[PDB]
Structure formats: C-alpha cells, structure tokens
C-alpha cells in the first residue's frame, strides 16, 4: 500500500463531506483511496499531452487546469485557478 495517498488522509477528507454520525466502511475508504490515484494518473496523462504538444519540459499548474477542463471537471477549475494564482503571487 504505497502506490496510494495515505488511507487516513483520504478518509479524513471523506468524513468532512458527511453528517457527523455517518460511518464509512474500510472497503469504501480503500475504494476511494484507489480512485484518487486513478484521478491523478488520468489528469496527468492529459496534462502531459498538453505540455508535450506545446514543446515544454515541465508540467505546470496551467497544464493541470487545462486537463481538468478537457476531462470534464469544469466545476473544480474556477476555484483551482484562483488558488493557483494566489500560490504564484
């Protein structure tokens, strides 16, 4: 178990979206943990194609934002773009 983000960190975020008395089974946590790694690999492949098409060597945050837009995560891109602009300032 090290191809993955740590299970407790993932599960702590899961728990924040639920009622305080919600329970999460260990198999659900493990499932979401695997899904998060697939999310990273999925989005990275797209951003990599972008980075390479434009003859650059380094995946940056704009590459990721473009990748998330292309792959249909438009609901995240606005807030991530604002987050990225503040990190860069």
């Amino acid at each position: 178990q090290d191809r993955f983000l740590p299970i407790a960190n993932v599960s702590r975020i899961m728990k924040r979206s639920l009622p305080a008395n919600a329970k999460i089974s260990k198999e659900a946590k493990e499932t979401v943990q695997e899904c998060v790694s697939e999310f990273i690999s999925f989005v990275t492949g797209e951003a990599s194609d972008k980075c390479q098409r434009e003859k650059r060597k380094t995946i940056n945050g704009d590459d990721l934002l473009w990748a998330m837009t292309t792959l249909g995560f438009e609901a995240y891109v606005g807030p991530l773009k604002s987050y990225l602009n503040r990190y860069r300032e």
Binding site: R3, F4, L5, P6, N9, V10, R12, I13, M14, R16, S17, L18, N21, A22, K23, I24, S25, E27, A28, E30, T31, V32, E34, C35, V36, S37, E38, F39, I40, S41, F42, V43, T44, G45, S48, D49, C51, Q52, K57, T58, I59, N60, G61, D63, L64, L65, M68, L71, G72, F73, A75, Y76, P79, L80, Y83, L84, Y87, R88
Partner: protein, 79 residues
C-alpha cells in the same frame, strides 16, 4: 492535507511526465480534495437511498456508475 511528495510520485508514473513544476503537486493536492469530497457525497446519496448510515463500497460503485465525469473509474469499482 495530502503529502506533496506522494502526489509527485504518482504523477511521475506517467509516460511523458518529465519534469514537474513545484506548483503542480500543490494544485493537485487541492484538486484531489475536491474530487474526494464530490465522490464521497455522491456515494452517500446511494447509502441514504438504501436506508443506511454506513457508506459502503457498493455506494461508491453506484455513484461512479451514474456519474459521467467518473466514467474513467467504472472498471476500477464495478458494482
């Protein structure tokens, strides 16, 4: 919230991944948070439809199966 070094490691498993700006794992950490939150609440809706207060694997599979954005996960988490 999510360790940047591990994100970078998962990123580097990619074919053309090459170099990675420092900002990219940072931005990714936030993106993974948004993804976990959305996947989890969509799964909870299936648990509440089955009259349960425990979120189970089949709830994640159900949410993935009925969400077009999560199409890339349908074979990872089959019902």
């Amino acid at each position: 919230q999510l360790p940047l070094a591990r994100i970078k490691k998962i990123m580097k498993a990619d074919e053309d991944v090459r170099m990675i700006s420092a900002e990219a794992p940072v931005l990714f950490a936030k993106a993974c948070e948004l993804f976990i939150l959305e996947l989890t609440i969509r799964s909870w809706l299936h648990a509440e439809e089955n009259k349960r207060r425990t979120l189970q694997r089949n709830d994640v599979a159900a949410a993935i199966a009925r969400t077009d954005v999560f199409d890339f996960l349908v074979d990872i988490v089959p019902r």
